[PDB]
Amino acid sequence: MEIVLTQSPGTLSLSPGERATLSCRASQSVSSSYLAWYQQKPGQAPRLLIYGASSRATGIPDRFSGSGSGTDFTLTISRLEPEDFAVYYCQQYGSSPSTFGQGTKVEIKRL
């Protein structure tokens, strides 16, 4: 049975400088915290941010972090830069077949 990943919220509306915390819930425990996070901006391929739940990819800024184990995982951006408004996906590779969440859009909050 495929592990189903469900992200929350669907859309996060915040201003630059604010903290963002994104959630990914798994239908089943994710082995060995084998959970990754990606960023995707329009017209571009996804970019790996975090793997093994909490390990930052090389060249990824300090303001990105990940945490969690079992079924509950989070990606936090400590202070939002303009370039951080994008869609974010989680992915598990603790079981075959690999599965992805549906994405959370982080968008600029209304004025």
Partner: protein, 114 residues
């Protein structure tokens, strides 16, 4: 370095074939309002295709080892197959187990239009 074939516009029920030139990948699509989904991939060591149940029976994933090129052929196209299709690779490996996708192609837009 993963370089994919150009965008395609297809009719309903037809098939599309996308290529990805590496200079054992997976195919992942971004379909509007459905996030990312893993379709299948060429697996390490055996170099044969595995598939997601959702697409089993109308996706065919092959690799030409000599030209380092992978293909995905998706048949009986439906409006919901409109999506950007990516090839992606994780990266002998004797380090810790890591199944995240570090490397991505530029994507191939397939539009299924009536």
């Amino acid at each position: 370095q993963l370089v994919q074939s150009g965008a395609e516009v297809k009719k309903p029920g037809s098939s599309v074939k996308v290529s990805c030139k590496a200079s054992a990948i997976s195919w992942v699509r971004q379909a509007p309002g459905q996030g990312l989904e893993w379709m299948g991939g060429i697996i390490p060591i055996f170099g044969t295709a595995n598939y997601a149940q959702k697409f089993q029976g109308r996706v065919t994933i092959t690799a030409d080892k000599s030209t380092s090129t992978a293909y995905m052929e998706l048949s009986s196209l439906r409006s919901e197959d409109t999506a950007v299709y990516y090839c992606a690779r994780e990266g002998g490996w004797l380090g810790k187990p890591i199944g995240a996708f570090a490397y991505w192609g530029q994507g191939t837009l397939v539009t299924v239009s009536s």
